[PDB]
């Protein structure tokens, strides 16, 4: 929906900074309002690996993976941090 994707947009462009705590907080915002925004749930997945936290980053893929199968980005990322982890 229209505020949802521009908060979704909003996540994007802290992500582009390097900004994962405040990308965070604007995924988080626009998934509160369009939990179906798979892209969104694999691009918090990102923000969530760059700050180390892998266990948050897998279920935040497994959502994304959930919602689109697809998403290749989020099936490597998904391999990725589950290697880091256990």
């Given at each position: 929906?229209?505020?949802?994707?521009?908060?979704?947009?909003?996540?994007?462009?802290?992500?582009k900074?390097?900004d994962y705590?405040e990308?965070?907080?604007y995924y988080?915002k626009a998934?509160?309002?369009?939990?179906n925004?798979?892209?969104?749930?694999?691009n918090?997945?990102?923000?969530?690996?760059?700050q180390?936290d892998?266990?948050?980053?897998?279920?935040y893929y497994?959502?994304?993976?959930?919602?689109?199968?697809?998403?290749?980005?989020a099936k490597q990322?998904?391999?990725?941090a589950?290697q880091k982890?256990?």
């Open positions: 929906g229209n505020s949802a994707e521009a908060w979704y947009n909003l996540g994007n462009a802290y992500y900074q390097g705590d990308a965070i907080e988080q998934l509160e309002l369009d939990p925004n798979a892209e969104a749930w694999y918090l997945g990102n923000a969530y690996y760059k180390g892998y266990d948050e980053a897998i279920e497994q959502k994304a993976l959930e919602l689109d199968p697809n998403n290749a980005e990322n998904l391999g990725n589950k982890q256990g």
